[PDB]
């Protein structure tokens, strides 16, 4: 029950293949709710979530305007960056911009973060006090200077602490049907013999939301326990996430292997044993 | 909602 509103902007140059590609996506919690993409038929901010479907054209116009603004400035910003790093016009390069507000369980504002990256590396990073930057670089130090003068108006603090929070609280009330619904994982164990000496136990969590889960394996006995293979959480492609953990156990010993699952959709942690 | 930049780099 620790909630977020976060935006992810990507800009990528294409020397003599048009002007730079620009893409924006917004997230409440682990649900994407909006896209903008300056190529695709309509160069407009669009809903990616059934609950955004009944905001009127006021909302979309503002967000479309905000996007073209960010796009067109990032086209400029790439040329600047190309300048400070002295890189040719033929090279493609990448500017990324990310920010979010985080609430606690109680709806108390917890943290703001905003951050820029050039060609993969950290470029310019907003500080704790939300009114001052750290630049990784000699070149970034130029951009540090320019972003302090203008953000003496505390534009980030204003957004992150206030506008970002207010709108989080708004998106939560609109989506609640789907978003504040805790979907506990459908959980089962699978057995995959290797030799007569050993099988693999695989503990599955399937079709759960939010995406914060813990899959741990433990063994009753004093015996050794081979390293668990945890696969990284992965989208079903329908809102929900999947995860699994796997051990190889000596054949015979499979009923001493208990798999615990922690998730907020679960009243209390479930424990799960293979049963053929 | 997002926000457009006010400065540049």
């Amino acid at each position, epitope marked *: 029950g620790s909630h977020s509103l976060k935006y992810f902007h990507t800009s990528v140059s294409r020397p003599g293949r048009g002007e730079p590609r620009f893409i924006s996506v917004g997230y409440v919690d682990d649900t994407q709710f909006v896209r903008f993409d300056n190529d695709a038929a309509s160069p407009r901010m669009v809903p990616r979530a059934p609950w955004m479907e009944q905001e009127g054209s006021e909302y979309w116009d503002r967000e479309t*305007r905000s996007a073209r603004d960010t796009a067109q400035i990032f086209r400029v910003n790439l040329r600047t960056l190309r300048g400070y790093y002295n890189q040719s016009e033929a090279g493609s390069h990448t500017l990324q911009w990310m920010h979010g507000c985080e609430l606690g369980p109680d709806g108390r504002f917890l943290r703001g973060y905003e951050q820029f990256a050039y060609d993969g590396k950290d470029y310019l990073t907003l500080n704790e006090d939300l009114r001052s930057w750290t630049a990784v670089d000699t070149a970034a130090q130029i951009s540090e200077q320019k972003s302090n003068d*203008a953000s*003496e108006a505390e534009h980030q603090r*204003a957004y992150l602490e206030d*506008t970002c929070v207010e709108w989080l609280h708004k998106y939560l009330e609109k989506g609640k049907e789907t978003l504040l619904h805790l979907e506990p994982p459908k959980t089962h164990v699978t057995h995959h013999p290797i030799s007569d000496h050993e099988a693999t136990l695989r503990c599955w969590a399937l079709g759960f939301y939010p995406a914060e889960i813990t899959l741990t394996w433990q063994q009753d006995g004093e015996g050794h326990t081979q390293d668990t293979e945890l696969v990284e959480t992965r989208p079903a492609g329908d809102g929900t996430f999947q995860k699994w953990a796997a051990v190889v156990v000596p054949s015979g010993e499979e009923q001493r292997y208990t798999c615990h699952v922690q998730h907020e959709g679960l009243p209390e942690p479930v424990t799960l044993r293979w049963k053929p | 909602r997002m926000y457009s*930049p*006010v400065s540049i780099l």
Partner: T-cell receptor
Amino acid sequence: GVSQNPRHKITKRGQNVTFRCDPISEHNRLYWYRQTLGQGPEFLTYFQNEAQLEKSRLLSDRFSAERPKGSFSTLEIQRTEQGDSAMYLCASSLGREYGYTFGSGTRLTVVE
Amino acid sequence: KTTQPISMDSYEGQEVNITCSHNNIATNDYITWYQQFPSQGPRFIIQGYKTKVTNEVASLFIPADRKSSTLSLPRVSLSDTAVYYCLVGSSFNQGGKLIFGQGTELSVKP
């Protein structure tokens, strides 16, 4: 800077006029303001590229802006009146704030 | 929305203090001042939120109450003789759609 064509216009009452603005290149926003004597500029309209966004509540449908190609813009006043006689200021920016620059203006006098 | 002085009277080499009046200013609205020389279009000089600011051109002071701020011109010249307008708002809702008052006609005499 912002450049305005022409710097001076006279026009007989009841007749049309068309000023033009050529913004700082790379500025994606262009705004039209109207300034009479001893008064701050009133906002008339603006554009993101060629898209004419918000258009003032108090604006005559005589007044009407165009920015085809999202570069230069032309303000057009139809069937001119006395009150119309005022400085028409143009402005260009890079998004909501940066590089906000005003042109020098086009002075309009409507003679009876 | 904000009132200032319709005009103000100065002598060369002095320091001049125009004060904007914004009692109902929003919590995140900031204060940004333009300078329009006779004939030419208005020019940005200084913007401030709550911290005092200081550029070549001038300095802006804001008190806690934040109900009024005060642009301060150093060693004022004959050239520095313009209308000085005070805008109160935010790009974020404004859209770069500036709202000007009457401003304050500054005279400088020798």
